[PDB]
Scaffold this motif. Sequence first.
Motif, PDB file in Angstrom:
ATOM      1  N   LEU A   1       0.888  -1.149   0.000  1.00 55.76           N
ATOM      2  CA  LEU A   1       0.000   0.000   0.000  1.00 55.76           C
ATOM      3  C   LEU A   1       0.934   1.208   0.000  1.00 55.76           C
ATOM      4  N   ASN A   2       0.979   1.923  -1.117  1.00 54.63           N
ATOM      5  CA  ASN A   2       1.841   3.090  -1.220  1.00 54.63           C
ATOM      6  C   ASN A   2       1.151   4.186  -2.031  1.00 54.63           C
ATOM      7  N   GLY A   3       1.875   5.263  -2.324  1.00 54.68           N
ATOM      8  CA  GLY A   3       1.291   6.362  -3.075  1.00 54.68           C
ATOM      9  C   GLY A   3       1.528   6.336  -4.576  1.00 54.68           C
ATOM     10  N   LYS A   4       2.058   5.235  -5.093  1.00 56.78           N
ATOM     11  CA  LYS A   4       2.315   5.131  -6.531  1.00 56.78           C
ATOM     12  C   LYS A   4       1.023   4.832  -7.308  1.00 56.78           C
ATOM     13  N   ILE A   5       0.137   5.819  -7.364  1.00 58.65           N
ATOM     14  CA  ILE A   5      -1.130   5.682  -8.072  1.00 58.65           C
ATOM     15  C   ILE A   5      -0.827   5.236  -9.503  1.00 58.65           C
ATOM     16  N   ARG A   6      -1.511   4.194  -9.973  1.00 60.05           N
ATOM     17  CA  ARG A   6      -1.244   3.673 -11.313  1.00 60.05           C
ATOM     18  C   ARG A   6      -1.948   4.358 -12.480  1.00 60.05           C
ATOM     19  N   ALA A   7      -2.827   5.313 -12.190  1.00 62.89           N
ATOM     20  CA  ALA A   7      -3.528   6.035 -13.250  1.00 62.89           C
ATOM     21  C   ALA A   7      -2.503   6.888 -14.000  1.00 62.89           C
ATOM     22  N   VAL A   8      -2.854   7.358 -15.196  1.00 62.45           N
ATOM     23  CA  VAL A   8      -1.927   8.181 -15.974  1.00 62.45           C
ATOM     24  C   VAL A   8      -2.034   9.675 -15.680  1.00 62.45           C
ATOM     25  N   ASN A   9      -0.926  10.369 -15.925  1.00 59.16           N
ATOM     26  CA  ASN A   9      -0.818  11.816 -15.751  1.00 59.16           C
ATOM     27  C   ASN A   9      -1.416  12.401 -14.481  1.00 59.16           C
ATOM     28  N   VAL A  10      -1.097  11.817 -13.332  1.00 57.08           N
ATOM     29  CA  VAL A  10      -1.617  12.350 -12.080  1.00 57.08           C
ATOM     30  C   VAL A  10      -0.632  13.424 -11.625  1.00 57.08           C
ATOM     31  N   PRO A  11      -1.096  14.676 -11.499  1.00 54.83           N
ATOM     32  CA  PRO A  11      -0.191  15.746 -11.064  1.00 54.83           C
ATOM     33  C   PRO A  11       0.208  15.591  -9.601  1.00 54.83           C
ATOM     34  N   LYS A  12       1.507  15.704  -9.337  1.00 53.52           N
ATOM     35  CA  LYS A  12       2.048  15.561  -7.988  1.00 53.52           C
ATOM     36  C   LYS A  12       2.239  16.895  -7.270  1.00 53.52           C
ATOM     37  N   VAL A  13       2.003  16.893  -5.964  1.00 53.56           N
ATOM     38  CA  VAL A  13       2.190  18.088  -5.153  1.00 53.56           C
ATOM     39  C   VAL A  13       3.584  17.939  -4.555  1.00 53.56           C
ATOM     40  N   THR A  14       4.485  18.850  -4.912  1.00 51.17           N
ATOM     41  CA  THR A  14       5.861  18.794  -4.431  1.00 51.17           C
ATOM     42  C   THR A  14       6.257  19.960  -3.535  1.00 51.17           C
ATOM     43  N   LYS A  15       5.663  21.126  -3.772  1.00 54.64           N
ATOM     44  CA  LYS A  15       5.984  22.322  -2.996  1.00 54.64           C
ATOM     45  C   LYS A  15       5.008  22.625  -1.875  1.00 54.64           C
ATOM     46  N   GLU A  16       5.539  22.837  -0.676  1.00 51.08           N
ATOM     47  CA  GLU A  16       4.691  23.169   0.455  1.00 51.08           C
ATOM     48  C   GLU A  16       4.527  24.685   0.477  1.00 51.08           C
ATOM     49  N   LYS A  17       3.363  25.143   0.921  1.00 54.47           N
ATOM     50  CA  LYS A  17       3.076  26.570   0.992  1.00 54.47           C
ATOM     51  C   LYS A  17       3.885  27.214   2.114  1.00 54.47           C
ATOM     52  N   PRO A  18       4.856  28.067   1.757  1.00 55.86           N
ATOM     53  CA  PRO A  18       5.682  28.733   2.766  1.00 55.86           C
ATOM     54  C   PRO A  18       4.872  29.721   3.601  1.00 55.86           C
ATOM     55  N   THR A  19       5.100  29.701   4.909  1.00 53.18           N
ATOM     56  CA  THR A  19       4.402  30.596   5.825  1.00 53.18           C
ATOM     57  C   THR A  19       5.191  31.901   5.984  1.00 53.18           C
ATOM     58  N   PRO A  20       4.508  33.053   5.857  1.00 54.39           N
ATOM     59  CA  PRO A  20       5.151  34.366   5.982  1.00 54.39           C
ATOM     60  C   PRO A  20       5.886  34.552   7.309  1.00 54.39           C
ATOM     61  N   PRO A  21       7.210  34.793   7.251  1.00 57.66           N
ATOM     62  CA  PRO A  21       8.059  34.992   8.432  1.00 57.66           C
ATOM     63  C   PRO A  21       7.471  35.983   9.440  1.00 57.66           C
ATOM     64  N   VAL A  22       7.684  35.713  10.727  1.00 60.74           N
ATOM     65  CA  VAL A  22       7.173  36.572  11.794  1.00 60.74           C
ATOM     66  C   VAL A  22       8.289  37.429  12.402  1.00 60.74           C
TER      67      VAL A  22
END
Length: 377
Positions: A356-377
């Motif tokens: 059981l892993n995240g290697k979805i077998r469907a085609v052209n599934v867009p991957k989320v690679t960048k996390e939303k940076p939080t504005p420095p305090v």
Amino acid sequence: QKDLADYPVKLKAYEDEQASIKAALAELEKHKNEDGNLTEPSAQNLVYDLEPNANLSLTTDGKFLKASAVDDAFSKSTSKAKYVQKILQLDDLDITNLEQSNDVASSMELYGNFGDKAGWSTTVSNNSQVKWGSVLLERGQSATATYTNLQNSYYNGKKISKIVYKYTVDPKSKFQGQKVWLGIFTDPTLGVFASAYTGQVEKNTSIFIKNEFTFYDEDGKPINFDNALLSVASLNREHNSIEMAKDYSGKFVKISGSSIGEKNGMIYATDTLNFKQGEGGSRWTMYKNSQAGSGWDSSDAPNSWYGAGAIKMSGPNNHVTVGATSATNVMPVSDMPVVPGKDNTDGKKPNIWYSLNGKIRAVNVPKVTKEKPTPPV
Ligand code: NA
């Protein structure tokens, strides 16, 4: 706070990808009914498909098996022939030789094609090195695997540091015998191999393993998934055997054109077999041969989606039961696909390899690679 200097490029990489993914989904919206496409277009925010170097730790209310005992079992009985050829044929291992008192160890011991068997090959990944821990469990008993020091896994661009899986032998399993051998690979994405096979095939049997898992972030806090995609693949269905997933959290999502669907709460090849092309409605043969599309049943096959589906899950704690069961335990013989020359009643080995892993077998599934940076305090 040099963050304010790096934040600019971080927010852009995010927004860029974020926007790049949105456009991709809108584009997939018109291909969702085409072969290999997720019926419900969606991105994969869970990157989890490559962890060959992860560390494994096990605890169990069952019994640990000495590595030497596992090695001897492999050299004996039904796996003996393959052993002599320097091959570890897991689906042929006779569990009988792992049930002696002198086979029990006090702790986990790894086995595989690496020690004096570095050259050897196994049925889990041919010659690529593979290692696994082994336990002997009875219905209701379990093994808890903790995978640490991963290096390629992320959730929403946030690094996953640990994964804790609890494997429990479903009491409702119908295999003959009281024991099950569980081989848990060090690479969490390879899954496990469960077997109650004692040398002979069995009729009306099954072997089901309950899987409970929690993924943790760099702070050791459980990760609360928000529609992450879990891959349920390699759901083989021969004329006499059906591999399926059931008793799961989340929502099943079908891959258009796949033989895999959901019926009565179970995920499996609902309407056809998927072993040999032209047999029982199967479109392609699972193993590689002369005919095109064959060998669909592998992690890298371009059409592996034929025996796969996915589950959209959320929350910090998820689970799914995976196993193999005689076709007769699922439906009347008169409702089954007919393969002249083959008896749908034939027994099967009560064993199975799944992951059981995240290697979805469907085609052209867009991957989320960048996390939303939080504005420095
Ligand atoms: Na499979």
